[PDB]
Design an enzyme around this catalytic site. Sequence first.
Site, PDB file in Angstrom:
ATOM      1  N   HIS A  82      -0.806   1.763   7.492  1.00  0.00           N
ATOM      2  CA  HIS A  82       0.148   1.350   8.510  1.00  0.00           C
ATOM      3  C   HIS A  82       0.977   2.564   8.905  1.00  0.00           C
ATOM      4  O   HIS A  82       1.094   3.531   8.149  1.00  0.00           O
ATOM      5  CB  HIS A  82       1.035   0.193   8.031  1.00  0.00           C
ATOM      6  CG  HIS A  82       1.969   0.555   6.919  1.00  0.00           C
ATOM      7  ND1 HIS A  82       1.609   0.487   5.591  1.00  0.00           N
ATOM      8  CD2 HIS A  82       3.260   0.964   6.938  1.00  0.00           C
ATOM      9  CE1 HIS A  82       2.633   0.849   4.840  1.00  0.00           C
ATOM     10  NE2 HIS A  82       3.647   1.145   5.633  1.00  0.00           N
ATOM     11  N   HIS A  84       3.980   3.920   9.143  1.00  0.00           N
ATOM     12  CA  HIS A  84       5.343   4.170   8.696  1.00  0.00           C
ATOM     13  C   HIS A  84       5.490   5.625   8.265  1.00  0.00           C
ATOM     14  O   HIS A  84       4.507   6.349   8.085  1.00  0.00           O
ATOM     15  CB  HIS A  84       5.731   3.220   7.557  1.00  0.00           C
ATOM     16  CG  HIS A  84       6.345   1.938   8.028  1.00  0.00           C
ATOM     17  ND1 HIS A  84       6.513   0.843   7.207  1.00  0.00           N
ATOM     18  CD2 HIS A  84       6.836   1.579   9.238  1.00  0.00           C
ATOM     19  CE1 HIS A  84       7.077  -0.136   7.892  1.00  0.00           C
ATOM     20  NE2 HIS A  84       7.284   0.285   9.127  1.00  0.00           N
ATOM     21  N   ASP A  86       6.449   7.120   5.514  1.00  0.00           N
ATOM     22  CA  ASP A  86       5.952   7.517   4.204  1.00  0.00           C
ATOM     23  C   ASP A  86       4.441   7.365   4.063  1.00  0.00           C
ATOM     24  O   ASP A  86       3.931   7.402   2.939  1.00  0.00           O
ATOM     25  CB  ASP A  86       6.653   6.714   3.105  1.00  0.00           C
ATOM     26  CG  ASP A  86       6.387   5.228   3.211  1.00  0.00           C
ATOM     27  OD1 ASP A  86       6.393   4.705   4.343  1.00  0.00           O
ATOM     28  OD2 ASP A  86       6.171   4.585   2.162  1.00  0.00           O
ATOM     29  N   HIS A  87       3.716   7.193   5.168  1.00  0.00           N
ATOM     30  CA  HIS A  87       2.259   7.106   5.120  1.00  0.00           C
ATOM     31  C   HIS A  87       1.555   7.801   6.278  1.00  0.00           C
ATOM     32  O   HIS A  87       0.447   8.308   6.079  1.00  0.00           O
ATOM     33  CB  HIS A  87       1.809   5.640   5.077  1.00  0.00           C
ATOM     34  CG  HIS A  87       2.482   4.834   4.011  1.00  0.00           C
ATOM     35  ND1 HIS A  87       2.183   4.970   2.673  1.00  0.00           N
ATOM     36  CD2 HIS A  87       3.445   3.884   4.086  1.00  0.00           C
ATOM     37  CE1 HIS A  87       2.931   4.139   1.970  1.00  0.00           C
ATOM     38  NE2 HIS A  87       3.704   3.467   2.804  1.00  0.00           N
ATOM     39  N   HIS A 158       3.396  -6.360   6.534  1.00  0.00           N
ATOM     40  CA  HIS A 158       4.335  -5.249   6.415  1.00  0.00           C
ATOM     41  C   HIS A 158       4.616  -4.635   7.781  1.00  0.00           C
ATOM     42  O   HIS A 158       5.772  -4.374   8.134  1.00  0.00           O
ATOM     43  CB  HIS A 158       3.781  -4.202   5.449  1.00  0.00           C
ATOM     44  CG  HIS A 158       4.776  -3.160   5.046  1.00  0.00           C
ATOM     45  ND1 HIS A 158       5.730  -3.379   4.075  1.00  0.00           N
ATOM     46  CD2 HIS A 158       4.966  -1.892   5.481  1.00  0.00           C
ATOM     47  CE1 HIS A 158       6.463  -2.291   3.929  1.00  0.00           C
ATOM     48  NE2 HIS A 158       6.021  -1.374   4.770  1.00  0.00           N
ATOM     49  N   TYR A 189      13.180  -7.476   4.861  1.00  0.00           N
ATOM     50  CA  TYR A 189      12.794  -8.098   6.119  1.00  0.00           C
ATOM     51  C   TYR A 189      13.431  -9.477   6.247  1.00  0.00           C
ATOM     52  O   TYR A 189      13.692 -10.161   5.254  1.00  0.00           O
ATOM     53  CB  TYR A 189      11.270  -8.239   6.221  1.00  0.00           C
ATOM     54  CG  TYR A 189      10.487  -6.944   6.341  1.00  0.00           C
ATOM     55  CD1 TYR A 189      11.110  -5.708   6.226  1.00  0.00           C
ATOM     56  CD2 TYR A 189       9.118  -6.965   6.584  1.00  0.00           C
ATOM     57  CE1 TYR A 189      10.390  -4.532   6.337  1.00  0.00           C
ATOM     58  CE2 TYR A 189       8.391  -5.794   6.698  1.00  0.00           C
ATOM     59  CZ  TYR A 189       9.032  -4.582   6.575  1.00  0.00           C
ATOM     60  OH  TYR A 189       8.311  -3.416   6.689  1.00  0.00           O
ATOM     61  N   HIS A 223       0.998   2.698  -2.209  1.00  0.00           N
ATOM     62  CA  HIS A 223       1.825   2.999  -3.365  1.00  0.00           C
ATOM     63  C   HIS A 223       1.042   2.641  -4.617  1.00  0.00           C
ATOM     64  O   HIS A 223       0.740   1.456  -4.826  1.00  0.00           O
ATOM     65  CB  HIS A 223       3.140   2.227  -3.312  1.00  0.00           C
ATOM     66  CG  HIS A 223       4.003   2.589  -2.144  1.00  0.00           C
ATOM     67  ND1 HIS A 223       4.797   3.716  -2.126  1.00  0.00           N
ATOM     68  CD2 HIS A 223       4.196   1.974  -0.953  1.00  0.00           C
ATOM     69  CE1 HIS A 223       5.443   3.778  -0.975  1.00  0.00           C
ATOM     70  NE2 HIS A 223       5.097   2.733  -0.246  1.00  0.00           N
TER      71      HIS A 223
END
Lengths: 264, 264, 264, 264
Positions: A82, A84, A86-87, A158, A189, A223
């Site tokens: 996805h 975001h 951190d990815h 997510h 969320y 993660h």
Amino acid sequence: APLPQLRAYTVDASWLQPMAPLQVADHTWQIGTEDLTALLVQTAEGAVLLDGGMPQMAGHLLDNMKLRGVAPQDLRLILLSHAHADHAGPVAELKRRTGAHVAANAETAVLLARGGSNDLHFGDGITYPPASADRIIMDGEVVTVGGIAFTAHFMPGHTPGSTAWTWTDTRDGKPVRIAYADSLSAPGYQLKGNPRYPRLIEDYKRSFATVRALPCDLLLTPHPGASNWNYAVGSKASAEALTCNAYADAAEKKFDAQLARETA
Amino acid sequence: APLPQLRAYTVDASWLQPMAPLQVADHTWQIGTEDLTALLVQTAEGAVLLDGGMPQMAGHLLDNMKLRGVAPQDLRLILLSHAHADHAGPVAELKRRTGAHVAANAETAVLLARGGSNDLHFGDGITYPPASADRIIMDGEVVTVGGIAFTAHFMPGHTPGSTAWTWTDTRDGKPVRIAYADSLSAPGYQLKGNPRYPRLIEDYKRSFATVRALPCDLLLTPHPGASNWNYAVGSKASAEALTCNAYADAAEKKFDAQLARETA
Amino acid sequence: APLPQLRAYTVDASWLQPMAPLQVADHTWQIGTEDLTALLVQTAEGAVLLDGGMPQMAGHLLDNMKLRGVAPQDLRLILLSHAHADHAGPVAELKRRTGAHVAANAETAVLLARGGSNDLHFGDGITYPPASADRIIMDGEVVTVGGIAFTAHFMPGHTPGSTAWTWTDTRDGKPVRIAYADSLSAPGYQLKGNPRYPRLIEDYKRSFATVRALPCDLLLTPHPGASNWNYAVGSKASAEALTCNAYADAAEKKFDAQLARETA
Amino acid sequence: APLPQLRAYTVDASWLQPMAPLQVADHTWQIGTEDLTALLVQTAEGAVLLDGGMPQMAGHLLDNMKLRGVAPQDLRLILLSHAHADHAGPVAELKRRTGAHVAANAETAVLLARGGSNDLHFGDGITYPPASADRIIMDGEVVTVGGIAFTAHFMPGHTPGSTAWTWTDTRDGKPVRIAYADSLSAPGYQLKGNPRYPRLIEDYKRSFATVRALPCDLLLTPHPGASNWNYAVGSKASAEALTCNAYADAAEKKFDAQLARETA
Ligand SMILES: [Zn+2]
Ligand SMILES: [Zn+2]
Ligand SMILES: [Zn+2]
Ligand SMILES: [Zn+2]
Ligand SMILES: [Zn+2]
Ligand SMILES: [Zn+2]
Ligand SMILES: [Zn+2]
Ligand SMILES: [Zn+2]
């Protein structure tokens, strides 16, 4: 009394701890950090990268690719779980320095185009350099590079464009079905009655069933702790790794607990 | 020894000190902060915004627009000096909440599309939420809103798409030619032999001549101190304001001094 | 023996036959052609356009908007059923000349960005001027303009981003629930085992159920004949108009007949 | 009396007459048609394509690349003269099927993003599938692939982003400076007082001087007849080829003649 200053996206120090390539199967390698998954698949026609972590991991990923004997122009494809920070952080920088193409669904593409800004849940708090998607993929579409077929499975939750990638590798001749499923978490969320995401609960619940049905013998997650991977112990990393059922069953229990406490 | 953390774009506290709308001419208003210029022009057919400052100034700009009796959907156009974080920050957020269109040259458009990332001189250090340009304008093109004509004058230097906007207003019936010229600074830039900008010196020198030739009776700059504006003193703000010649002559002397010290 | 020439997208002459605004409810108007639906909703805070038809209909739509007493800058929003050439054609030209914003889901946005090129079923045969989406909407999200709330209902099938819009108007004080559902046709599509759209049958079947469940008292479709509308007869246009059930029930029968003949 | 039908972009039959790769230097090859230039440069680290012609030439270009022993994923870069339909047509299709990156200036990038639509002079009459620019290049920037350095020279006139590319090859060990200059024509353009291009004459005149100063021993143009190339005669193609001075001197005389007749 002036307006507040900008705040940088700070993460745990374990997310940025570099490690050497840890072998998963005959063709799949972990070239990220201790707590951020970045998968590298080596074929005879080039390389495929799955996620990349934080934006400042671009140089580290290229160093590990050089360690595996892969030139920058040999990275043919970049796949995302996805979009975001951190990815998909170094995706923009990795496209400029590798000549690679990014394949993602329409929802991951539009979020990647605005660099994580205007997030449904986080707003503009986690903005990273924007990148463009070269190929729009649909649910169940097969992406083939060097004979290795990557099947996409849309699991929205997510993010609206969260995607799980499934391919078959080998464990010394013996085949193995590897499933890199995205996160099923909803950190902070608003689940019930979210005006930006009205059908969020329907997407989360249906994604819980999609992960259980994936053809998988070895599971990985963006993660590693979410699937009980321990990248820092080398060979024993996949020791306590979870299954698709246990991973989706555990994530659903804490979703219903979060949904229950949110109603109160 | 992990990878370093992300760093936020921090500025001086005076750049974020909010102020009330300070009138410049019959139709032009300053609605930004003390050290960041954000011009609002009110016509009979809507409003036009020139720059907006830091990304966290979006709400403050809307408050001052409400103070001038302007609804969000009355902002028809957003014009930019150059697409850096401290001037085109809230452009993305202002487009979502006002229904406005952004006009900029091709070079400002492409830098706005990637949110200041991959900067020629700053890299990814100053990234802001990305926005899209709705109308591509050429050098000398006239943009008319409510009878007030905005003429663009390309002055590349600080950025490849740096633009000066010139229009004619009134000082109680008496006409006045206002010129909002962009910055002519090169803070830490590599002037001589820059592989990302080979013709930078030729663009800076020619832009020095372009500013001197602008039809102007009252000059403004994105940073008010650069043209000797003092927004914090109200009526006496334009007291010591510079001319187009003095502004371009002073900026050129420190460019040649910077060019001379760079060769050594 | 040279390469073949380019071929233009030619349609039936009835698709391009201009007509005057035909009133549907107190606020909704048909301002398109005889066989192409283009809906105009007039509120106290501006206008909303739903589809626009062929690319050469831009001037005709503006003439009918002027006929209803609507200025170009009063068009605040442009909503799309799906981003094909015969429905989102003049969107790019209408954005430049009206100052309007386009709201669409991620799948309609990405197809609108490349102007219908690289279509899943038609390739590059039906290319129209590209446009950008200003606001990405999710399934079930409410879009409010001037008090009139527009609810989106994703019905993927004809295109991955096909959307039905539902709002409530009045028939002389008496409220009426109007549903503008997209097409459920698959003209020449490969339904079984399409590598570009693996889950097409699952999306078509589920979209058949989504249309039946829409809150509707008066149904409209991008092609009026598909819902038994006769725009050319004025007041008696909605005479034989179908219901949501009859429209989805009829479209499903010919989908299963097409699916059956395709297997043979 | 309905609205008119769409019209396809039809060209001369000689523009679409396929030919085999005609060698220009040791590394540069002509793989286009008889009257449309598409240059292929083969290095040890991949291939570079300069222009591609009409949109329906994509398959023909790949066939000639296969004839030269170049795989699709070996095409690393796509360079453009200007982003019109008869030169950047198959760029979108070639990016999807080759994994290549496109480098162009900001003005060529924005016109490529909207697929030639909203042209300054042609409007929407010549629309082709849109493509995105992966790397924004500046005036005088060097692009190196496999040791061969490509220097860009901005020559705005035909389009705001018209670019001439210069590189040095070999004629059997003997070096040769090849200059692929863009067109200097203005077919049906409004030169004097064009509101969409106010500084057009200043750009055309300055581009006339830029072409004369290029380091060149063998000149090529997107249309071979414009530089007196005859691709259909094989070895004698470069027989009557013009110089940079003669090419710019001839193009300027007919520009001033066109400018003179336009004033009357
Ligand atoms: Zn995340
Ligand atoms: Zn995460
Ligand atoms: Zn700046
Ligand atoms: Zn600044
Ligand atoms: Zn259609
Ligand atoms: Zn249709
Ligand atoms: Zn051309
Ligand atoms: Zn041409």
